[PDB]
Amino acid sequence: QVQLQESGPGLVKPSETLSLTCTVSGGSVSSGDYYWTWIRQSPGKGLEWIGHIYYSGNTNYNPSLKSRLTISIDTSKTQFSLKLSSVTAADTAIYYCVRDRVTGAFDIWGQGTMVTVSSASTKGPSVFPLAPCSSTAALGCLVKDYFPEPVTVSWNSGALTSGVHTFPAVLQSSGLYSLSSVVTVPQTYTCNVDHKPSNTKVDKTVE
Amino acid sequence: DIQMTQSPSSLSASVGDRVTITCQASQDISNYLNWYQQKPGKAPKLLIYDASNLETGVPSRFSGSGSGTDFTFTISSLQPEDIATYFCQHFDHLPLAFGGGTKVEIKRTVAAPSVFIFPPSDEQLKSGTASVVCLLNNFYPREAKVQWKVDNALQSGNSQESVTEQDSKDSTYSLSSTLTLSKADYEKHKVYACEVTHQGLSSPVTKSFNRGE
Amino acid sequence: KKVCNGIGIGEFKDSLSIDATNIKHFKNCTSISGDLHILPVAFRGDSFTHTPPLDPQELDILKTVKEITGFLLIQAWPENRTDLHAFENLEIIRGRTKQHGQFSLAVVSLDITSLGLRSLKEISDGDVIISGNKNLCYANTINWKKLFGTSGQKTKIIRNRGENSCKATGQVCHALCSPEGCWGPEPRDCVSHH
């Protein structure tokens, strides 16, 4: 049917402006039946309604973010955007763009994009193999030292999904993130690591 | 503003059990309430709209009831794929707000983990640091203890753990422990062992390797 | 006296809303035979057909309309006008035809401070939804059961101004008002009294 997808930078320096764009496919944004809405999720704040915009131009903002908030529509490209200025670490969250039907439901959500507010700089990951030291066997990859989140890991370009475990990232004492993905195996095995904030893609073949 | 309080904050139940969670509004919000399901790593999914109506495509085991201030969300027969956090949301007046969420997990039979230890790669050793990984695969319950031993010396404070969310098929967990050492310190010792302690193990299991071998 | 058609019927055939060009067909009109649409085209204009924005003082043409057989759908209103006094003398919305076969009255995303439907006394069939009005008051006071004519007609006053926000600016019903609610602050805005 209709799908929403977010786009924008995953790292925003403090006191600067966060910009995100939602592209609506399979339909138009110029309908009187839907509120084009932004929603964010973070620990400490949970799910939070940021605001929406109607195709008449009318907007409604959460008073907790109103002073720094701007939501606009570009019906030409069937898009609507989010602008949040003077950001701090309290604005680091996952941001969803949502279709809010006027009947009263968030019935279509985007996949969500991670936005980190930090004065630190972007660093691409190092990918190291996880192989045993010479009946179920296990192998994997180690995505080491990257910033910020997230990192996508797939095996054999998505062809291998059975028995895959990609653990949540941990924050090391250096301020950099690190995770590992593993596969259990009873043939080439390649992990596909993608770190979009640094434009880093790696295909690590494990033997 | 309207405050949405959910109860309980988390629960665990067996497959087939009846699960009931509560959403309580600080004001009368009529039936202006929706229920959402957020599975691990996914955006929330609409299940119930207008407090009582099942969204098309949602299984019939989910239902909702209530008006005014007190609302209830019910799963008639809990299934393994229902592992998620469930949120309630009001749209009475501005601004809109969600509840704190209720985490729902599956209680299953005890399952012992499969343990694997991975030596650091020579590629990483050239960088001056060594990472030793221990993998605990498909176990229940979630509680598990990982003990690192480097030449029978118990390691503490130099390892980090990471645990997956509950599997949506077999309701198990997986855990990875990363021991971080400098390259120089890694060359000083020979035996690197990972000892795990779990309810499903009659005695702790140890996987180990010798450096260079 | 005489009646006129709604949007999409008669003089408004092949038209989507009430713009600054077809409002002249509502002069001396007392009854609408169908649904009228007030879309954002009416006040932002139309770049395609060069229709200028409808003047906010020109909405007083609809003051002679008191009967609507279809549904009343408002999704745009002048930022100058703080109420719907263009329909000040509207008395009945039959709702024979409904938006999506559900709604007979819809007020979506306006800056109005009140509804101002002082003469509305009956909504025969259809649900009433009022969403996205950040400045609107006096809505939750109205007893909509007095207007409904069919059992099952629902009222969705959602995403609107808070109860205390209207109470903070003293924008509530008059002291002489009946518990059934009001369309504004004035004593004449009451739906009933003793």
Mind giving me the DSSP string for A127-161?
A: EEEE------EEEEEEEEEEBSS--EEEETTTTB-
Identify from B26, B27, B93, B94 which residue to disrupt to test chain C contact, counting C C-beta atoms within 10 A and taking the largest count: B93
Q: Which residue in the block uniquely carries the two structure tokens 């808070």? A: C162
- Sorted by sequence, the CB contacts under 8 Å of residue A179 that are 6+ apart come out as A143, A151, A153, A166, A167, A168, A169, A170, B162
CA distance linking residue A26 with residue A28, whole number of Å: 7
Question: Which among B1, B27, B94 is the nearest to C160, CB-wise?
Answer: B94
Please give the torsion angle defined by the CA atoms of residues B153, B154, B158 and B161, in that order, rounded to the nearest 10 degrees: 140
Domains of chain B: 1-107 (2.60.40.10), 108-213 (2.60.40.10)
For chain B positions 48-107, those within 8 Å of chain A (CB to CB) are 49-50, 55, 87, 89, 91, 94-98, 100-101
CA distance linking residue C32 with residue C24, whole number of Å: 14
Q: Please, what is the Cα angle at B89 between B85 and B92, to 5 degrees?
A: 175
Cis-peptide into C53, omega within 30 deg: no
Judged by a CB distance cut-off of 8 A, whether residue A103 touches chain C is yes
**Which residues of chain C are within 8 Å of residue A55 when distances are taken between CB atoms?**
40
Please state the φ and ψ torsions of residue C188, each to the nearest 5 degrees: -80, -15
Task: Say if the Cβ atoms of B174 and A62 lie within 8 Å.
Answer: no
DSSP 8-state code for residue C99: B
Question: Which among B27, B94, B96 is the nearest to C134, CB-wise?
Answer: B94
Task: Say if the Cβ atoms of B93 and C134 lie within 8 Å.
Answer: no
Report the candidate in B121, A156, A30, A34 with the shortest Cα–Cα distance to residue C109: A34
Residue B21 in contact with residue B100, Cβ under 8 Å?
no
Q: Tally Cβ neighbours within 10 Å of residue C122.
A: 14
- C37 CA to centre of own chain: 10
Task: Say if the Cβ atoms of C75 and A56 lie within 8 Å.
Answer: yes
SS3 state of residue B188: helix
Shortest alpha-carbon distance between residue C111 and chain A (Å): 8
Question: Which among C158, C162, C163 is the nearest to B91, CB-wise?
Answer: C158
Nominal resolution (angstroms): 2.5
**Which residues of chain A are within 8 Å of residue B46 when distances are taken between CB atoms?**
105-107
Sheet holding B129-139, edge to edge: B114-118, B129-139, B173-182, B159-163
> Hey, what CATH topology would domain A120-206 get?
Immunoglobulin-like (2.60.40)
Question: Which among B89, B116, B176 is the nearest to A132, CB-wise?
Answer: B116
Judged by a CB distance cut-off of 8 A, whether residue C46 touches chain A is no
Burial class (CB in 10 A: 0-12, 13-18, 19+), C101: exposed
Cis-peptide into A148, omega within 30 deg: yes
Judged by a CB distance cut-off of 8 A, whether residue A158 touches chain B is no
Task: Say if the Cβ atoms of C109 and A104 lie within 8 Å.
Answer: no
SS3 state of residue B153: strand
Please state the φ and ψ torsions of residue C163, each to the nearest 5 degrees: -65, -45
DSSP 8-state code for residue C166: H
User: What is the amino acid identity at position A93?
Assistant: A
CA distance linking residue A11 with residue A116, whole number of Å: 5
- Sorted by sequence, the CB contacts under 8 Å of residue B65 that are 6+ apart come out as B51, B52, B71, B72, B74
CA distance linking residue A184 with residue C29, whole number of Å: 78
End-to-end CA distance of chain A: 42
Task: Compute the radius of gyration of chain A from its Cα atoms.
Answer: 20
Sign of torsion over alpha carbons C160, C165, C169, C175: positive
Identify from C158, C163, C164, C166 which residue to disrupt to test chain B contact, counting B C-beta atoms within 10 A and taking the largest count: C158
**Which residues of chain A are within 8 Å of residue B178 when distances are taken between CB atoms?**
142, 170, 178, 180
CA distance linking residue B155 with residue B144, whole number of Å: 17
CA distance linking residue B180 with residue B158, whole number of Å: 6
Residue B135 in contact with residue A182, Cβ under 8 Å?
yes
Task: Say if the Cβ atoms of B98 and A168 lie within 8 Å.
Answer: no
Experimental determination approach used: X-ray
Q: Tally Cβ neighbours within 10 Å of residue A25.
A: 10
The domain limits of chain A are 1-119, 120-206
DSSP 8-state code for residue B107: E
CA distance linking residue A18 with residue A79, whole number of Å: 17
For chain C positions 115-174, those within 8 Å of chain B (CB to CB) are 134, 156-163
CA distance linking residue B174 with residue B136, whole number of Å: 6
Report the candidate in A20, C57, C156 with the shortest Cα–Cα distance to residue B91: C156
Task: Say if the Cβ atoms of A54 and C129 lie within 8 Å.
Answer: no
Q: Tally Cβ neighbours within 10 Å of residue A162.
A: 8
Residue C98 in contact with residue C121, Cβ under 8 Å?
no
Task: Say if the Cβ atoms of A104 and C158 lie within 8 Å.
Answer: yes
Looking at domain C1-194, what is its CATH homologous superfamily? Receptor L-domain (3.80.20.20)
**Which residues of chain B are within 8 Å of residue A144 when distances are taken between CB atoms?**
124, 131
Residue C123 in contact with residue C155, Cβ under 8 Å?
no
CA distance linking residue A68 with residue A71, whole number of Å: 10
Question: Which among B87, B116, B164 is the nearest to A138, CB-wise?
Answer: B116
Cis-peptide into C56, omega within 30 deg: no
**Which residues of chain B are within 8 Å of residue A99 when distances are taken between CB atoms?**
none
Shortest alpha-carbon distance between residue B14 and chain A (Å): 24
Question: Which among C39, C132, C156 is the nearest to A58, CB-wise?
Answer: C132
CA distance linking residue B86 with residue C72, whole number of Å: 37
Q: Strands of chain C (E only): list them.
A: 3-5, 31-33, 36-38, 67-68, 72-74, 92-93, 103-108, 122-123, 127-131, 155-158
